Amino acid sequence: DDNINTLWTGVNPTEANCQMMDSSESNDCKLILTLVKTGALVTAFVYVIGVSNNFNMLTTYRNINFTAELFFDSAGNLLTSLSSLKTPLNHKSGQNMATGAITNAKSFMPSTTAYPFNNNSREKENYIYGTCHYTASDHTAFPIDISVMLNQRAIRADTSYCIRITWSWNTGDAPEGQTSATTLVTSPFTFYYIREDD
Amino acid sequence: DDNINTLWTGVNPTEANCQMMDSSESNDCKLILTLVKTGALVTAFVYVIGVSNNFNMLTTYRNINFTAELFFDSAGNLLTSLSSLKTPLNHKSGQNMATGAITNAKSFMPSTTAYPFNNNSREKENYIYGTCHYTASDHTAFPIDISVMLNQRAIRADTSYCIRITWSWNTGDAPEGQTSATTLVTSPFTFYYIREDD
Amino acid sequence: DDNINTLWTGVNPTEANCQMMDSSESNDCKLILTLVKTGALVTAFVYVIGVSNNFNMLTTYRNINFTAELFFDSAGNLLTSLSSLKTPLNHKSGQNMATGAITNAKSFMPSTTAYPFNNNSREKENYIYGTCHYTASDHTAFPIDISVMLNQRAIRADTSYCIRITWSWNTGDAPEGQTSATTLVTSPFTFYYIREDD
């Protein structure tokens, strides 16, 4: 069954599954996250589809950053209370998540050997960088910086694995104006990391 | 069989398999396209090797764009009449294409759930961006912009899936002078998308 | 056995496994390289963790390039005497290298059909480009250019496959401008190439 090689959020969930902004008091966007087992690595495929007005209106600002913090327990299961993503991940079932148990969830996690916790000497190894784009109302591509930090620092005793994905930009002109903003959508960002063993 | 997880053009086809320019009277380049099933995703690996002098001479201009439009039917089979690529894709057979029937061709296609057709409010989700490089005669790397649009709009009724790939550059100087232009080759660009189910 | 789809260095080797710089008294860094078979392609995942003080202090200079030269024999075995990486690759065994025979080592190699040797007219096809980042002591990300040349030129009769990975920067400011005591860590760079057949 190839479906168990994927751990994901499903494609375009009906309702917002993620509370990205600190100012938000409920889910403000759809986090689309797909983790695929690819040999010793995980192929991580991530983007956001904005839902709340305040999140969508971030496209009108010149200086923005927002972070999806994903915390997982020792079994590789998402801790929804601590995490930005409020719906657990599961396997592929068509375009949706499966509903059963998760096979080898821990082996989707970022390796604590490759990406340690509380190790100042190896702190640089926890960082992955890249770019994605916001497609503007005029069809131009607005580049957005992405920083991923794997593990490095835990926030609670039961947080065994961490993925923190930060989207940011600092420009002279905002992606949109107040009247042109619609939905904050980031283009998919694919990154790779050495996966934990079961 | 691992070979059926690849749907591709084969390596460096003897003859030009693609008509990139409308002004060309026949195939003017080799489109190298490899689609690999990677869990819930497809790994899409693409570049061009120019063949015709007119296409190759595009490297002598400062402002250029060209697009490979790939249209597929409901079975996931290439519609060569509509598409830039004039030879159907098939599975891996060594460095070449297999000649038999394609297994699960529909699941190589970009998801219509992830990448809808004619949906204005979700149109931003259809776009993927990146960069490749042209290796110049002096061995400097000339960056080329890439815009990919999946599905979004279908030009004919039997078209069920679309992959449109646009290479472009707009610079102060052309990649090559008149006496240094040889072959327009783009470095491989790899992108990812959520695949359709069978 | 999925473990045989990876050919790698293992995670964070105890000792430096690579001599990046010709002048170094011994191995000067940890080359972390993971090659994963992905359909017709190899997903190549590479970065460097500096070990020696002389190599780590390269980040204080403004115009630096260094290259990992990886040479393999006709069976796909690393030729350590000729190569920057001085420890053979092997399969995944947890976070470490396996210690047995390598299964189908040849099909991890860059295709000589896709990436020829001594063919000037096709030389542009041998190149892959990208960027990674050096994380500075202030935790800012400094972009580093990466160039990969596959095959193209052999250095000895038994060198059947070559992977040459060059990290470089040439900017107004050095990657590290705040201290002489910080580890040269490059963020992971992932590239793709068409693999040889067994």
Contact in structure between B185 and B58 (CB atoms under 8 Å): no
Q: CB–CB of A35/A43 below 8 Å?
A: yes
With contact defined as beta carbons under 8 Å apart, do A20 and A33 qualify? no
Q: How many helices and strands (H and E) does chain C possess?
A: 1, 10
What one-letter code names the amino acid at B13?
P
Residue C28 contacts residue C16 (beta carbons within 8 Å):
yes
Kindly give the pairing relationship between strand A29-38 and strand A6-8. Answer: antiparallel
∠ at Cα A127 (C85, A119), nearest 5°?
85
Which one, of B92, B115, B91, lies nearest residue B163 by Cα? B115
Q: How far is CA C151 from the centre of its chain?
A: 14
Q: What's the number of CA atoms in the CB half-sphere (13 Å) around residue C176?
A: 20
Q: Pull the structure tokens for residue B135.
A: 């290796």
**What is the distance between the alpha carbons of residues B122 and B115, in angstroms, rounded to a whole number?**
8
* Reduced 3-state DSSP string for B4-25: HHEEECCCCCCCCCECCCCCCC
Q: Chain A contact for C142, CB < 8 A? A: no
Pick from A164, A169, A157, A166: which is nearest to A193 by CA? A164
* Alpha carbons A78 and A92: distance in angstroms, whole number: 16
N-to-C CA span, chain C? 18
| Residue type present at position B77 | N
What percent of chain A is helix, strand and coil (3-state, nearest 5)?
A: 10, 40, 45
The minimum CA-CA distance between B13 and chain A, rounded to whole Å, is 28
Give the helix/strand (H/E) hosting B191.
Answer: strand B189-194
Cβ proximity of B70 and B78 under 8 Å: yes
In chain C, beta strands by DSSP E: 6-8, 29-38, 41-50, 63-72, 92-93, 96-97, 127-135, 141-150, 161-170, 189-194
Chain A residues near residue B147 by CB distance under 8 angstroms: 141
Q: Measured between CA atoms, how close is B186 to chain C, in angstroms? A: 8
CA dist B93 and C123 (Å) reads: 24
Nearest-angstrom CA–CA distance, C90 and C112: 22
Give the CA radius of gyration of chain B: 17
Question: Which helix (H) or strand (E) covers residue B36, if one does?
Answer: strand B29-38
From CA A117, how far away is CA A125, in angstroms rounded?
Answer: 11
Smallest CA-to-CA distance from B91 within B9, B156, B17, B196 is with: B9
Q: How far is CA A161 from CA A77, A153, A157, C13, in A?
A: 9, 9, 11, 22
DSSP state at residue A122: G
Those residues whose C-beta lies under 8 Å from the C-beta of residue A184, and which sit 6 or more positions away, are: A29, A48, A49, A50, A55, A56, A58, A59, A134
Host H or E run for residue C54: helix C53-56
R_g of chain C computed on alpha carbons? 17
Residue A25 to chain C, least CA–CA distance (Å)? 31
C180 — contact with chain B (CB < 8 Å)? no
- Using CA atoms, how far apart are residues C30 and C188, in angstroms rounded to an integer? 13
Tell me the CA distances in angstroms from C1 to A39, A45, B92, C43, one per residue in order: 10, 25, 21, 18
Find tokens 């159907």 and name the residue: B88
Is residue C107 classed as helix, strand or coil in its secondary structure?
helix
Q: Are C10 and C95 in contact (CB under 8 A)?
A: yes
What is d(CA C47, CA A124) in angstroms, rounded to the nearest whole number? 12
What domains does chain C contain, in order, with CATH numbers? Answer: 1-198 (2.60.90.10)
Q: Which chains share 3+ C-beta pairs under 8 angstroms with A?
A: B, C
Q: Which residues of chain B lie closer than 8 angstroms to A2, CB-CB?
A: 37, 39
Surface-to-core class of residue C33, CB atoms within 10 Å of its CB (0-12 exposed, 13-18 middle, 19+ buried): buried
Q: Measured between beta carbons, which residues in chain A are less than 8 angstroms from residue B38?
A: 36, 38, 43
The two three-digit tokens of residue C24, written as one number: 């170094």
For the record, the structure tokens of B41 come out as: 């995703």
Q: Which residues are CB-neighbours of A175 under 8 A, at least 6 positions away?
A: A59, A60, A134, A136, A142, A169, A181
The pair of three-digit structure tokens given for residue B43, joined into one six-digit string: 């790994």
